[PDB]
């Protein structure tokens, strides 16, 4: 059990695991403080946490809260914080480098880039999925879904550069980068009068198992075949890198 | 169609024999003697499996596309399959 | 033995430098189309519907995940949108997509 | 000269402010006019020479245009920003801070203005060329040939340009427009096919024009796409029409759908209205600007702008009205009934003859409400009146104890009505021992009511004592619940076992 | 993972239980020794001693079994050999 | 095994083996001749032309035209293209067929994917070379024919210009596909998929045309108009003008030749005795014309144009008066105005030797070939040889710069085919490089 | 094929036979199942049945043996489990 | 000398890396990253042992002359030798 | 088309030939179109070509049907009479 004192009183928005620099069996557990703390600890360390502090212009109107954090598989010390302010903040913890101005609405979801470390997702009230490359923070591309909200995004570094996400209408969109940008290729629907899905996640052990959650206490599994592998899809990475540099 | 092509191939001076191995070392068609037919089917069945594993071990999202093994006496080619592959032996000389 | 290693490198060099280039641009048969699996049909739906029966009547799903190790283990958690600051609101429902998990 | 273009874009603002401030009535009514204008004239002209030199070092002809575009835009911002602030601020500085003879008049020759336009023309030319480059397979012959045809034309307006032979450049631009035209004609054809292929999807249509807007605005292409631009206009009218109706039918915020559920709903419906309207404003505003850029102010736009702008203005008013109510209610509530010595009063048990001790504390809900309230206003770029900041800082001090005080209060009130479900003395007797620990502290309840207000540390001690007991009792409760389930499950199986078979 | 039975000298009911038991053991443990220990102990209890179980990714074996008490099968890439003898 | 669903694998395995065997087959200073003159389908046809290749430096094509005498009672098209190799044993390797007179033939420079030819009546055809043998009429004694193209005879257009063609050439200038634009409705890459080179076709009218289409994913039958095969079309078109300076008043062209170095440059010759220069991208680089140190007109009716296959960009051309000029690209006037031996007759064929020295070959009407080696001698022919079986129709010099070889394939009006190898002249190579630089400097 | 004994419940003389038998088996046979079979059979002959042998590079086991008839050792990188049961 | 010839090979447009496997699957020279250096060396050592045995099995008087493995990802070639072989990987694309 | 001799396309082809044959009869006045004004001939050949193009399209469609029927038969010869 954790503590109840000043260590971590805030109503943390997320919990994430990381590998510890020590033996690979050890995984540190973090939370996303709503107040501006970067909190990491070990198993027994949940009591008397071990690491704590990203604040730009401290002691003032500076309350750096975030709703989600994603970490790049590339390196333990690269991750993005989904700040409530709306502008994604890069942090390596506290240091920070880029403010990503293309996405201005309060963030509800982030995701790290799949392989090649250039397709970093942020999405919030804007309803627009802005990808960017942390190397320079340019607007790479913005999906222009005319939908109320977004609540989850689906990436698989295992698969080619493909995208799907669950939106606050009940539909789940799929996008084949090599075919379309704004037009969903495959779309999964709900029943006639079901309220929107509020979550989406995909099994890390691919096995073509996708799961989403409806407005009822029911989780539905789909077996998807569309995302087959192939030699050549890499082109999507070159297309995005060239767009960024021009 | 396929039988006519196989005959035409066999007529080529380079080709030393053709074996159609179907059920994991069990042939149905051969242009060779029986002892060689059975041995060859077995060897190439095991051999191709090893190559396919090697490729998957190098990268877990790629399989065999083709396999060739060469020797002083003759040269053997096989192709990947879902259910069964075909064996060709030729004299490279 | 460096000159012995070099001698080997010379012999194979003679083979590979010639053989490789001839093969690389041989532009040989390109009709290889093998799948090793039956073609899957259009994406399916409602593969499995896991949930706590009684509790699912009033709750809605807000957090789901899969166990990386036990790929059969699907986790879900529903809750009520309001009152999440005071009372016990829900449970964590897991179900395996494993042998004999017919329910 | 030691500063880059990307930095001086901000210096122009700082320098204008500080110089106008120091001229104020400090030690003398007004410093002699000599320096009053001379220093500003030097500063303005110095920016001119600065930008002129720095843009030359960009090599506005070479391949790395990516970095050039960034630095070039900065150069323009420097030139224009200084002129704008000079012309605006001068009008008030000489009336409010320094009684200078000149009033409601400017001083600056605005040579930066011509320099800024010079770079704007260069940017527009380079940008158009890059847009043609994307279509290089369409106009390959034109793009390659014209590049070198236009090079000697650009050479009529070199880096560090001074408009003292400007007519020469005017001739160069006239030829540019007449010679580049074959490129525009071929691309215009391609664009018509590529846009008209869009099956009247407002989404794809807007993006098609948005991505190549620099080309569409060209006289040649604009006319070729006239039918497509008018078609988009009509659809854009349809869009804001739908938004208007959706707003009107939901603005009251009564059904859950009209508000829009959010995780911040725990503060109040204000957060929902803000986000809801924010989206409406952005969508309507964007459509207005796109129509303006593309239509070139045809009757189609006149009608569209009227309707869409009126809607946009109503949306802005909606937001402000909802905010004003929010702010007023919070300020009123604080001033009315919360500033009056709110304390951490002990559990009012006797009032509720059910052992349900009512820990009547004004801060019960208000702590988290205030924290969310300030978070909302801060994130959204609103000023938080001092009154809220003051009570918020106080709330922080209470929070340190309320987090643990509620725990021990809850355990007491809860265990009292959960242990009775089993009637095992194991729990009923030890719960009384816990109650005794509570009562021991309660012996000083009258004084506990005043601790947090002045010094919460004493209370922390009392709570920790009760929490230690609560941890022991909670452990016993968990064991009890575990066993209770265990025995229930086995008994319900045994009654279903037929002794004659199983 | 996927259960594939290659050889069996065992009743249909015991075959399925062997796979099911190994599957649960594989879900609970990562170490082959501990997986084997679970499988062995469960069989001694339900089907009388004495069973032996070997679990691994790389081995060959030559063993003697009592009739109707031997199975060899895979769970994914891991082979499980289970039999009675003694 | 009973099911055709598995026999497909057997087919594919045969296809692999067949190609590998075909690849395995590609094995190896005076008269030393060879003959490859099997007549499996050439019993009555007459030779009309020869063409060599660049992908397979030991490959040659030979055009044959059937007379009214039918060696076989079958419906036998009179126009075929014989494809064979120098080192292969007697017997053609492949054959293509068409309906009307075929000429203006060329091959694909990157790989043997397509074969191109211009029709006498102005249309354009292209055969699919990289195709297995199936769905083609076969014969015993086995030999199989091949016919597959969708000609411009089908869907009507303007690119035909209803004017006979004069020459075609593969234009290796494809440098597009820099990127598919992020907004797909405006991505130009898609339409260039598979396009590695274009094909040019010039007609008598002096109108130049360029296009190419490539596509593999197809099935036996298509909804659009095509042959019943899996082949691309001719939707793409570009048109370029010519004869602006030259142009009763209506003039025509005779020959065109592009620049191997930068294929965007080319020259065009006319009957009026002049050759113009131009290019594709920037049409104002050097719009000059070539002319010898002469006056008046001298309508020598230039009929053969070639290019020296070496660093310095020098074009060569010959005319009906038996003269040849070296029209250096960077000069309006030629370097060496040589009047060939036997000038009393015309130039019938020119070529540059595929060898290290800049040896140049000319054939005349009397079938007396003259050779120059300007690296070691003056403008006088360094060698010559006529033939008793005179009335030559065509020649082509074929060789490869390392194993190496050098050959010369010829054909006679009698319908026979000949070839010999005099590779002693393949290269010094040291002396050749020494004199090569010298000639360039002086 | 250097021998290192990790665990044994076996007399020293039987331990030697275990190593010597496996050593010969590994010299003669390339295939794991055949190596195991050689070793097992030699023990059945000299020390009576019923012996079982596992030879491999990656496995865990949990087995029951007759007292004083168990050995587990490596030859190089290959583990050999040799015991009697039944 | 040989260092230059190996670089020469590496410079070829097809070649994506060279590994000189010496000590029974453990290389001594590489132009590749470390994970790949050991990955290819180890896997191909196991394979070539199988391939050489395969030849001896199909005919008891012949050894390996050459092997080629093709895949969707890349292609690998090896030749046998007295002491050790060499691995070259190319991109067929 | 002549490889299958389908009476449908054979009849459509006859109708095509009727266009040519009736057009030939018109040559009494039309045989000098090119001399005076070829534009009429351009329309002429396009209309005739269009009829041929339609014929070509119909033929491929019938081939599509033909294949469909073939696909069925090869299935039918794999039916177990004693079970199916």
UniProtKB/Swiss-Prot annotation, chain A:
Superkingdom classification of source: Eukaryota
Cystine bridges: none
Tissue specificity remark: Expressed in several cell lines (at protein level).
Coiled-coil features, chain-numbered ranges: none
Location(s), subcellular: Cytoplasm; Cytoplasm, Cytoskeleton, Cilium basal body; Cytoplasm, Cytoskeleton, Cilium axoneme; Cytoplasm, Cytoskeleton, Microtubule organizing center, Centrosome
WD repeat intervals: 7-51, 102-142, 145-185, 192-232
Subunit structure: The cytoplasmic dynein 2 complex consists of two catalytic heavy chains (HCs) and a number of non-catalytic subunits presented by intermediate chains (ICs), light intermediate chains (LICs) and light chains (LCs). Among them, a heavy chain (DYNC2H1), two intermediate chains (DYNC2I2 and DYNC2I1), a light intermediate chain (DYNC2LI1), and a light chain (DYNLT2B) are unique to the cytoplasmic dynein complex 2, but a subset of the light chains are also shared by dynein-1 and dynein-2 complexes.
Family note: Belongs to the dynein light intermediate chain family.
The protein's name in its UniProt record: Cytoplasmic dynein 2 intermediate chain 2
Organism: Homo sapiens (Human)
Gene name as annotated: DYNC2I2
Part of the whole protein covered: 258 to 534 of 536
From Swiss-Prot, chain C:
Subcellular compartments: Cytoplasm; Cytoplasm, Cytoskeleton, Cilium basal body; Cytoplasm, Cytoskeleton, Cilium axoneme; Cytoplasm, Cytoskeleton, Microtubule organizing center, Centrosome
Organism superkingdom: Eukaryota
Region described as DYNLRB1 binding: spans on this chain: 3-28
Residues in the signal sequence: none
Tissue note: Expressed in several cell lines (at protein level).
Similarity-based family: Belongs to the dynein light intermediate chain family.
Role summary: Acts as one of several non-catalytic accessory components of the cytoplasmic dynein 2 complex (dynein-2 complex), a motor protein complex that drives the movement of cargos along microtubules within cilia and flagella in concert with the intraflagellar transport (IFT) system. DYNC2I2 plays a major role in retrograde ciliary protein trafficking and in ciliogenesis. Required also to maintain a functional transition zone. Acts as a negative regulator of the Toll-like and IL-1R receptor signaling pathways. Inhibits the MAP3K7-induced NF-kappa-B activation pathway. Inhibits MAP3K7 phosphorylation at 'Thr-184' and 'Thr-187' upon Il-1 beta stimulation.
Protein name: Cytoplasmic dynein 2 intermediate chain 2
Organism listed in the record: Homo sapiens
Curated annotation (Swiss-Prot), chains E, G:
Pfam families: Dynein_light (PF01221)
Cross-link for Glycyl lysine isopeptide (Lys-Gly) (interchain with G-Cter in SUMO2), residue positions: 40
N6-acetyllysine modifications at: 33
Result for mutant: residue 85 to A: Abolishes growth factor-mediated phosphorylation. Increases BCL2L11 protein level and promotes apoptosis
Induction remarks: Up-regulated by ATMIN, PAK1 and estrogen.
Region (Interaction with ESR1): 64-86
Principal subcellular localization: cytoplasm
Keywords noted in UniProt: Acetylation, Activator, Apoptosis, Chromosome, Cytoplasm, Cytoskeleton, DNA damage, Dynein, Host-virus interaction, Isopeptide bond, Microtubule, Mitochondrion, Motor protein, Nucleus, Phosphoprotein, Transcription, Transcription regulation, Transport, Ubl conjugation
Subcellular location: Cytoplasm, Cytoskeleton, Microtubule organizing center, Centrosome; Chromosome; Cytoplasm, Cytoskeleton; Nucleus
Effect of mutating residue 64 to A: Abolishes interaction with PAK1
Matching InterPro entries: DLC_sf, Dynein_light_1/2_CS, Dynein_light_chain_typ-1/2
Disulfide bonds: none
Recorded superkingdom: Eukaryota
Record-level GO BP terms: apoptotic process; DNA damage response; intraciliary retrograde transport; motile cilium assembly; negative regulation of DNA strand resection involved in replication fork processing; negative regulation of nitric oxide biosynthetic process; negative regulation of phosphorylation; positive regulation of insulin secretion involved in cellular response to glucose stimulus
Expression sites (tissue/organ): Ubiquitous. Expressed in testis.
Phosphoserine: residues bearing it: 85
GO CC terms in record: axon cytoplasm; centrosome; ciliary tip; cilium; cytoplasm; cytoplasmic dynein complex; cytoskeleton; cytosol
Family membership: Belongs to the dynein light chain family.
Protein's organism: Homo sapiens
From Swiss-Prot, chain F:
First and last residues of every WD repeat: 97-137, 175-221, 297-337, 342-382
Keywords in alphabetical order: Cell projection, Ciliopathy, Cilium, Cilium biogenesis/degradation, Cytoplasm, Cytoskeleton, Disease variant, Phosphoprotein, Repeat, WD repeat
Keyword Transcription found: no
GO molecular function: dynein heavy chain binding; dynein light chain binding
GO process terms (BP): cilium assembly; embryonic skeletal system morphogenesis; intraciliary retrograde transport
Signal peptide: none
Major location (coarse): other
Keyword Nucleotide-binding tagged: no
Annotated coiled-coil segments of the chain: none
Compartment(s) of residence: Cell projection, Cilium; Cytoplasm, Cytoskeleton, Microtubule organizing center, Centrosome
Clinical note on disease: Short-rib thoracic dysplasia 8 with or without polydactyly: A form of short-rib thoracic dysplasia, a group of autosomal recessive ciliopathies that are characterized by a constricted thoracic cage, short ribs, shortened tubular bones, and a 'trident' appearance of the acetabular roof. Polydactyly is variably present. Non-skeletal involvement can include cleft lip/palate as well as anomalies of major organs such as the brain, eye, heart, kidneys, liver, pancreas, intestines, and genitalia.
UniProt family annotation: Belongs to the dynein light intermediate chain family.
Record-given protein name: Cytoplasmic dynein 2 intermediate chain 1
Organism of origin: Homo sapiens (Human)
Entire protein: shown range: 583 to 1055 of 1066
